[PDB]
């Protein structure tokens, strides 16, 4: 649940 | 279209300061006490046509009261100021706000705490709480960083005029003259002072 | 079924905040003008670069005159940044007075890219 | 040509001043400046009261009566008692006549309010000097003239309030106790005649100028009379029906209604509390059916601002709140009163929604009020459960960014509601995170105000709910990001995904994977250019690191070293984009971390790391610096210098005591190149002058000396070891920055030195006797020499000179002992120059300073320097004293001057100061302190008040001087001396209150 939410964090671009 | 502002309150909170901030936007550091009152014409440019305010600035120090609550007949509204730095001012606005609704029955009147620039504020805002029961509106505010500056203006205009959806609006600005050797000299001279006398607040951020 | 400003002639070439400043000689002493967004604004009729700062909040002109070729950004002595010059017509206060003005920034690299500006406006107002 | 009513030796020409006067009022620019300066000389001479009675027969100006009533009350205030028993009498007589005067002339009754109310006014300044004791039939006159007219009733409503004013609200501190006292008894003696005329006037009615009138005065009755008054009659129940109806006196009554509810009635009594929900009950029914329902838009009213809804909304949240607060316990037990109860709340709701800051501060306060009663007392907050239900959206809606003290209150306020029911406040974020997905309420103001509520219930939910409840709000926040295309957009997402991880400290200590991503995340961020970010970056990373500086110090299971490390190494490439400021935050941070580690050679390790950089720029600097010392005038340089310096404060901040090993390593050379800085401004001050301290160098050059300077105070203050203070920092501190001050010019002279050297005493000082000798020697005397001269110049000096001297005289009172005689004077001269001083600042140490001293010299014992300071400056502190106690312009430290002056009072009434304070030859030998001391202050007071009698000055002397033992007494004796100088003829039986 978490090891996802970290992941879609880490993908934050502009 | 104009109306009569008197501005009361103790000696030393600002109320000089502010006002000749609205005229000429300069920032007075000395205190030079008011003698009597001092009427000054204020205009404001609104939506709905340009709005004078006839502020008479009046004197906090008791010696140079003058003719005191003379000064409030036919006023149509009122700031009561004090200093958030001094308790003592914060006392004294039942006292000013007393003398000042005995002479105006019903006029629209804002509190003003001046100096919330101050680091060392000394009256809390959990402590003023005068102006709920006696209807006055409240705006902290600091004539040295223009912090809520025009708020009190624009919420009495608001209120005078009957339009909540008042706003300020630019004034237009006309073109200017596109343009002496008789006078090149002299301005040179104005220029060196001017150039060697040092900025004011040049640890200011602007 | 019936159902129920003097700035459109012009364009901006540089945008810039800004505290300005004025000298009172009869006090020998500084004063401040006002504080906002200082313009520089080419009429598109007559290519002609003015000036125009309003202040904050109150949007009261606090500057308004013709950039001339003819004016000379000095140094203070007490900053890097910030320009003094002389003014002999502007026109925030009604009639075209004369000031010697002083305009300070947040930082010398804002006070260095006015200066960039300036002069270019200056070559606009002699073609 | 105006200045002709100035000549008092002809008559006054009337139809002049109305002239003057209108030129004033009506005029504009010199013409009215001039005639300004006219009316006043003109009110201001002592002989116009004489030309009153003539203003007010034969002027027919309005403004000019007022004037010259003004003229009156200053005279009945201050030297009434002096006029002969003639005059006086006299005023009375055509001041009341012409109150009748203006009463029968229905005209001039209508327009000029302004004229017969100062005329009211005037009439009761004579009242407190002569009322009852000399006009004791006033009130039984008042009434029965109330009969003979509507007018003349009113008016005198209008009277009996002012006079009600004066007495109970406005009597203190303008009138002695005694004649205060005196005249509230007068006024109990005989309320009871005029409650029965103003409750006649109620019943009867039926003039509304004249019930407002009277419904104004009983507003001031309620602040003291008995509640029977209230209660045994049928007061109530006329105004919580009868004047709630018509909108004029609804505005007044509603005010009325509120001061009643702001009793504590007797509990134990079973008939007020039915009159207590009686009227209660009446006034919501007159207000559903007379002015809105319940369901009214009360957001929509207050913004329309129509008439007086915007004084009336405000009076009605005044009243509710008021009553609620007091009795809706009356409320919450009796079913048949649930329905009103919530009315009355829903009520409030409405008014919540109101946009108006100063007016949801005032039901905000209400709203902890009651969410904290339902979160301790039993069986309540199933009956709000609606009210709260609502409650919570408003605050959800209206939240601001964490004035700050409005934000605190509504997180206080909004975890109550969190906790009287998590699901239900769930729900609604949820939901309003699903209305911003979809756009409906899509908007920056919106999801700000939203992701800061939702950040303000941290710690309110269990471990687990916060779990689900945080993934569902990041995983929508990071979805909503995705779904924005805008530069701009994203930023704001950005700043409110990282606010709120920040505000759950909890969910990132259990979860180290995402805690480490957020990290490495915020470190992306400090390299963008966008406006706020970086600091948005920097911001959240120490925000992170404050509350979870333990997870960084560790070794994390899936990691291979603790992560602090990690972040050293990168340290450079992280705070690479950043500006000075954003890389000394950075800097701090891991400061934070670094204290953690509780092993001494690994933190010490860690701070070799962190301070590699700086120390590197700083050795390299450090030896360019001495090679070629005309390196100081380069600006790049004394900028590198300067930052290097703030990042070690930074650091030290955080570590404080930890951060010695790092000090010593730049220690001595940084107090050497305090020297070379110093010697380049002198160089300057001499080859430019004193303009050359404006000039953007030495501007800079001086930041260096200050930021050297500001170190060191944050390490001493934060020191553990004392003995390393002493024996390593401050010798080479004091024999570097002492001589340099003290030979610099005043306006070279940096006042951090002074508040250093302050730090140093506070925390030292009682190991360093010779320390602080050589600290006074240095600073003491050139310092004063600059602000000896004004109370305006060098501000800043003139505050840590004090600050300075106070903890000198507390820690090590010795120094001044060993200071000769006349430089001892100057000490002296110095503590009460300050007592002279307006500003706070200066006033309040001032005072303090001369009351410590005095209580050294007093347990020094008796012995000839203790002996010797009460002969030279015992009566110098007691006149000094005395002096801002009653200049009027030092009303601000009034306290502090009482008690300094009750203290010097009581070592005379205790024997506690052996030897005379009197010469042998200007008194009989024998005569103790205690009579010199009331004959030295009894002839001090004549002088400075000649207007005193002798019998003013025995009396308060003797009343004074025997309460030196009670504060609050000797408080009160002052304060009625204060009103006594003021006026002439005081009373002198007045000190005999208490
Ligand atoms: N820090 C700070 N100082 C202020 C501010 N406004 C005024 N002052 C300072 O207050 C002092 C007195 O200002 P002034 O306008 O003369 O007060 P006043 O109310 O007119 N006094 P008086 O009633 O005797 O005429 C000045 O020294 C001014 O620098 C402020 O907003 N911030
Ligand atoms: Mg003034």
Not at chain 2, 52 to 57: H, L, T, Y
Not at chain 2, 87 to 101: A, F, G, M
Not at chain 4, 189 to 203: G, M, Y
Not at chain 4, 445 to 456: C, E, Q, V
Request: aromatic content about 10%; some cysteine.
């Amino acid at each position: 649940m978490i090891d996802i939410l970290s992941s879609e964090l880490s993908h934050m671009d502009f | 279209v104009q109306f009569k502002l008197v501005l009361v309150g103790d000696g030393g909170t600002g109320k000089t300061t502010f006002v000749k901030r609205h005229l000429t936007g300069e920032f007075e550091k000395k205190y030079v006490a008011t003698l009597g009152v001092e009427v000054h014409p204020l205009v404001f440019h609104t939506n709905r046509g340009p709005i004078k305010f006839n502020v008479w600035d009046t004197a906090g120090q008791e010696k140079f009261g003058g003719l005191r609550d003379g000064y409030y007949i036919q006023a149509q509204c009122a700031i009561i100021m004090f200093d958030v730095t001094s308790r003592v001012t914060y006392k004294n606005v039942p006292n000013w706000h007393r003398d000042l609704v005995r002479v105006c029955e019903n006029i629209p009147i804002v509190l003003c705490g001046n100096k919330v620039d101050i680091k060392d504020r000394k009256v809390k805002a959990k402590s003023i709480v005068f102006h709920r029961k006696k209807n006055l509106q409240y705006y902290d505010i600091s004539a040295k960083s223009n912090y809520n500056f025009e708020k009190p203006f624009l919420w009495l205009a608001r209120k005078l005029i009957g339009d909540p959806n008042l706003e300020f609006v630019a004034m237009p600005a006309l073109a200017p003259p596109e343009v002496d050797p008789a006078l090149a000299a002299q301005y040179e001279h104005d220029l060196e002072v001017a150039q060697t006398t040092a900025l004011p607040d040049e640890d200011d951020d602007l | 079924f019936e159902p129920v400003t003097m700035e459109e002639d012009e364009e901006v070439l540089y945008k810039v905040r800004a505290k300005l400043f004025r000298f009172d000689a009869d006090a020998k002493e500084w004063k401040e003008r006002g504080t906002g967004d200082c313009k520089f604004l080419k009429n598109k009729k007559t290519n002609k670069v003015r000036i125009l700062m309003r202040r904050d909040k109150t949007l009261k002109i606090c500057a308004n005159h013709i950039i001339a070729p003819e004016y000379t950004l000095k140094p203070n002595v007490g900053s890097d940044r910030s320009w003094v010059y002389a003014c002999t017509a502007d026109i925030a206060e009604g009639e075209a007075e004369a000031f010697t003005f002083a305009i300070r920034f947040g930082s010398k690299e804002n006070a260095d890219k006015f200066k960039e500006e300036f002069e270019k406006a200056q070559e606009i107002n002699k073609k | 040509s105006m200045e002709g009513i100035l000549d008092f030796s002809n008559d006054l020409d009337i139809a002049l001043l109305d002239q003057v006067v209108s030129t004033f009022y009506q005029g504009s620019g010199v013409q009215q400046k001039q005639a300004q300066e006219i009316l006043t000389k003109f009110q201001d001479n002592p002989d116009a009261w004489q030309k009153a009675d003539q203003i007010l027969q034969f002027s027919t100006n309005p403004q000019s009566k007022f004037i010259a009533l003004s003229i009156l009350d200053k005279l009945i205030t201050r030297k009434w008692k002096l006029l002969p028993n003639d005059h006086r009498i006299g005023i009375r007589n055509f001041v009341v006549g012409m109150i009748i005067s203006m009463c029968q002339d229905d005209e001039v009754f209508k327009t000029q309010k302004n004229l017969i109310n100062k005329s009211d006014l005037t009439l009761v300044q004579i009242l407190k000097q002569e009322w009852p004791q000399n006009w004791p039939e006033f009130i039984p006159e008042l009434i029965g003239s109330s009969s003979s007219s509507v007018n003349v009733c009113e008016n005198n409503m209008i009277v009996l309030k002012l006079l009600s004013e004066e007495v109970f609200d406005f009597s203190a501190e303008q009138m002695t106790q005694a004649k205060a006292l005196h005249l509230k008894n007068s006024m109990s003696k005989e309320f009871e005649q005029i409650f029965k005329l103003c409750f006649q006037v109620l019943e009867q009615g039926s003039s509304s100028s004249l019930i407002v009138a009277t419904l104004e005065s009983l507003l001031r009755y309620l602040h003291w009379i008995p509640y029977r008054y209230i209660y045994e009659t049928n007061i109530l129940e006329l105004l919580s029906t009868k004047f709630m109806t018509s909108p004029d006196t609804r505005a007044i009554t509603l005010k009325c209604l509120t001061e009643v509810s702001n009793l504590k009635i007797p509990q134990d009594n079973d008939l007020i509390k039915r009159q207590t929900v009686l009227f209660f009950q009446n006034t919501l029914q007159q207000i559903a059916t007379s002015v809105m329902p319940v369901t009214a838009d009360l957001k929509a009213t207050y913004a329309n601002a129509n008439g007086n809804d915007q004084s009336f909304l405000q009076d009605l949240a005044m009243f509710l709140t008021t009553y609620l607060a007091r009795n809706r316990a009356l409320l919450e037990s009796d079913e048949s009163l649930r329905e009103l109860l919530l009315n009355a709340h829903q009520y409030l709701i409405q008014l919540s929604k109101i946009e108006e800051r100063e007016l949801f501060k005032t039901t905000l306060d209400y709203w902890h009020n009651l969410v904290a009663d339902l979160f301790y007392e039993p069986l309540k907050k199933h009956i709000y459960e609606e009210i709260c239900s609502q409650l919570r959206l408003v605050i959800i809606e209206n939240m601001v960014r964490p004035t700050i003290q409005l934000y605190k209150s509504e997180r206080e306020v909004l975890v109550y509601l969190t906790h009287l029911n998590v699901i239900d406040t769930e729900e609604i974020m949820i939901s309003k995170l699903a209305r911003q997905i979809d756009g409906s309420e899509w908007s920056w103001h919106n999801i700000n105000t939203l992701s800061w509520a939702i950040g303000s219930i941290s710690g309110t939910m269990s471990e687990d709910t916060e779990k689900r409840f945080v993934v569902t709000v990041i995983k929508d926040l990071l979805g909503l990001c995705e779904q924005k295309r805008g530069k701009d957009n994203k930023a704001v997402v950005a700043s409110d995904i990282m606010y709120v991880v920040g505000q759950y400290p909890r969910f990132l200590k259990a979860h180290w994977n995402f805690l480490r991503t957020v990290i490495l995340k915020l470190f992306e961020f400090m390299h963008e250019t966008h406006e706020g970010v970086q600091d948005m970056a920097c911001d959240t990373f120490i925000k992170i690191v404050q509350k979870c500086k333990y997870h960084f110090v560790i070794q994390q299971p899936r990691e291979s070293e603790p992560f602090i490390q990690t972040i050293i190494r990168d340290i450079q490439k992280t705070t690479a984009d950043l500006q000075p400021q954003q890389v000394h935050t950075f800097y701090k941070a891991c400061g934070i971390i670094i204290s953690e580690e509780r092993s001494v050679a690994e933190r010490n390790r860690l701070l070799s790391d962190l301070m590699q950089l700086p120390n590197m720029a700083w050795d390299t600097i450090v030896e360019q610096s001495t090679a070629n010392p005309t390196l100081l005038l380069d600006s790049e340089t004394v900028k590198i210098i300067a930052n290097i310096i703030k990042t070690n404060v930074a650091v030290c901040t955080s570590m404080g005591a930890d951060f010695y090993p790092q000090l010593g390593h730049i220690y001595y050379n940084m107090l050497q190149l305090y020297r070379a800085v110093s010697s380049m401004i002198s160089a300057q001050v001499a080859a430019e002058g004193l303009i050359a301290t404006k000039t953007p160098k030495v501007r800079g050059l001086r930041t260096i000396k200050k930021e050297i300077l500001k170190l060191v105070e944050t390490y001493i203050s934060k020191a553990r070891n004392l003995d390393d203070v002493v024996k390593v920092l401050v010798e080479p501190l004091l024999n570097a920055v002492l001589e340099d001050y003290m030979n610099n010019v005043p306006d070279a002279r940096d006042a951090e030195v002074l508040n250093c050297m302050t730090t140093v005493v506070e925390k030292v000082g009682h190991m360093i006797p010779q320390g602080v000798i050589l600290i006074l020697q240095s600073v003491f005397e050139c310092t004063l020499d600059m602000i000896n001269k004004d109370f305006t110049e060098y501000p800043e000096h003139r505050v840590e000179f004090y600050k300075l001297l106070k903890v000198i005289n507390e820690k090590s009172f010795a120094a001044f002992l060993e200071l000769p005689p006349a430089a001892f004077k100057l000490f002296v001269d110095a503590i009460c120059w300050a007592f002279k001083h307006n500003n706070r600042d200066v006033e309040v140490n001032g005072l303090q300073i001369a009351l410590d001293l005095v209580k050294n010299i007093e347990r020094m014992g008796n012995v000839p320097f203790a002996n010797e300071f009460h002969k030279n400056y015992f009566f110098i502190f007691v006149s000094e004293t005395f002096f801002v106690l009653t200049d009027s312009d030092h009303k601000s430290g009034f306290s502090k001057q009482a008690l300094l002056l009750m203290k010097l009072i009581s070592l005379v009434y205790d024997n506690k100061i052996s030897v005379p304070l009197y010469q042998e030859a200007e008194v009989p030998q024998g005569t103790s302190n205690q009579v010199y001391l009331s004959q030295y202050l009894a002839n001090m007071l004549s002088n400075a008040f000649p207007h005193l009698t002798s019998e003013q000055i025995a009396s308060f002397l003797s009343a004074l001087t025997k309460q030196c033992k009670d504060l609050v007494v000797f408080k009160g004796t002052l304060r009625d001396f204060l009103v006594q100088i003021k006026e002439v003829g005081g009373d002198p039986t007045d000190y005999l209150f208490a």
